[PDB]
Amino acid sequence: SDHKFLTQAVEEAYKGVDCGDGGPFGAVIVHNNEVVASCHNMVLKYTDPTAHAEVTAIREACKKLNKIELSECEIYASCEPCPMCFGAIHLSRLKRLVYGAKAEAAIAIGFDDFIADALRGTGVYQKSSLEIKKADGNGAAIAEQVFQNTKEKFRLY
Amino acid sequence: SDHKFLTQAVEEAYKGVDCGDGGPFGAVIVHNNEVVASCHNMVLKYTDPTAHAEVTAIREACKKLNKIELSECEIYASCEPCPMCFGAIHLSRLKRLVYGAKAEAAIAIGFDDFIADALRGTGVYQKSSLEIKKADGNGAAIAEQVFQNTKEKFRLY
Ligand SMILES: O=c1[nH]c(=O)c2ncn([C@@H]3O[C@H](CO)[C@@H](O)[C@H]3O)c2[nH]1
Ligand SMILES: O=c1[nH]c(=O)c2ncn([C@@H]3O[C@H](CO)[C@@H](O)[C@H]3O)c2[nH]1
Ligand SMILES: [Zn+2]
Ligand SMILES: [Zn+2]
C-alpha cells in the first residue's frame, strides 16, 4: 500500500512540473487506503509561497472531509517535508507520514537548505509524535530520481 | 511605526475572534509604511488548519503584489509565530518579523505546546538569519493580555 501512494505522490510531482504549476513535489493524503487528496506544488500557479504540495493536500483533504483535523489519515510526500509543511502536518493531526526522498535531493538541484529538525528528531521546542517512515528500495529510487529527471524543467522558487 | 502595526495586529486578533473566523491571532504585512495585508486566523471560517493569521497574511499580500517573495515587506504578528508560520515567513522572504506576545501566553489558555526552534535559535538543521524583534513594554503588554481576554470567546483548535 505504501509504494502505491508514494508513487502517486511522485506522479503528482512530475505532473505539476509538466503543467508549470510549481516544483517537483507531490503529496497524497489517504484514509484507510482511499485517496482523500492528491496534489502537487502550486506556488507558481497560485502566486503563493505557502502552496507547497503538502499544504495544498492538507487544505484539500480538510475541505473534502469538512473538518480541520485528519487524525485518521496518512500523508505520502514525494520529498521530505520542509519545516512549514511539517508544522502544518502537525497541526492537521495526520497520524502518519511516509516520504520518499531526503531533503538533500531537493537541495542538490537548487532549493534552500531548509530542513525540519522535528522530523529528523533534533527538535527541542517542536516535538512531533506522528509516525514517520522514510521509504527504502524502489520507493527511494523513484523519489530521488524525480530531481534528476526534472532538473531544469521548472523555475526555481 | 512598530507600535502602530503591532496594535493593528492585536486588533485583528480581537476582530477575528469576535466574528468567529478563528482564534485570537492577527498578522499585518507592511511595505515601507504601506499596509499590504491585515488578517487574522481563519481556521474556523475556512475549515483550514493552515489558515493561521500569518499564513493568511502572506497569501493575501503575495496575491495583491503579484509576487511570491515579500523581501521588501515586514510582518507584525500579535503572537509569536508557530513552527508552520515561521517556515512560511522564511519561504516568503519577508525581511523582518515583529511579534507581540510569547508563545507561552497562548499555550497558557490551552493551545499546543508547539514552538518554532528556528525562531528561538535552538535547532540543529533549521537556522534563521531573519531579523526578529520581540516587542517590549506597551504594545507587548497589550498583546500578552489578548489570550486571557478572549479565552471564553472561542473553541480551541
Ligand atoms: O515540502 C515541500 N513542498 C514543496 O512543494 C517544495 N517546493 C520546494 N521545496 C523546498 O525544497 C527544499 C527541501 O525540502 C526546501 O528548501 C523547501 O522549501 C519544497 N518543500
Ligand atoms: O502562529 C500562529 N497563528 C495562529 O493563527 C494560531 N492559532 C493557534 N495557534 C497556536 O498557538 C500556539 C502558540 O503559537 C501554538 O500551539 C499554535 O499552533 C496559532 N499560531
Ligand atoms: Zn513544504
Ligand atoms: Zn502559525
From Swiss-Prot, chains A, B:
Catalytic reactions on record: guanosine + H2O + H(+) = xanthosine + NH4(+)
Residue stretches making up the CMP/dCMP-type deaminase domain: 1-114
Tissue specificity field: Expressed in roots, leaves, flowers and siliques.
GO cellular component, one term: nucleus
Top-level taxon in the UniProt lineage: Eukaryota
Chief localization: cytoplasm
Enzyme Commission number: 3.5.4.15
Keyword hit for Nucleus: yes
GO biological process: purine nucleoside catabolic process
Keywords from the UniProt entry: Cytoplasm, Hydrolase, Metal-binding, Nucleus, Zinc
Active site: E54 (proton donor)
Disulfide-bonded cysteines: none
Function comment: Catalyzes the hydrolytic deamination of guanosine, producing xanthosine and ammonia. Deaminates exclusively guanosine and 2'-deoxyguanosine but no other aminated purines, pyrimidines, or pterines. Deamination of guanosine by GSDA is the only source of xanthosine production in Arabidopsis.
Protein name: Guanosine deaminase
Source organism: Arabidopsis thaliana (Mouse-ear cress)
Lineage of the organism: Eukaryota, Viridiplantae, Streptophyta, Embryophyta, Tracheophyta
Included range, full protein: 29 to 185 of 185
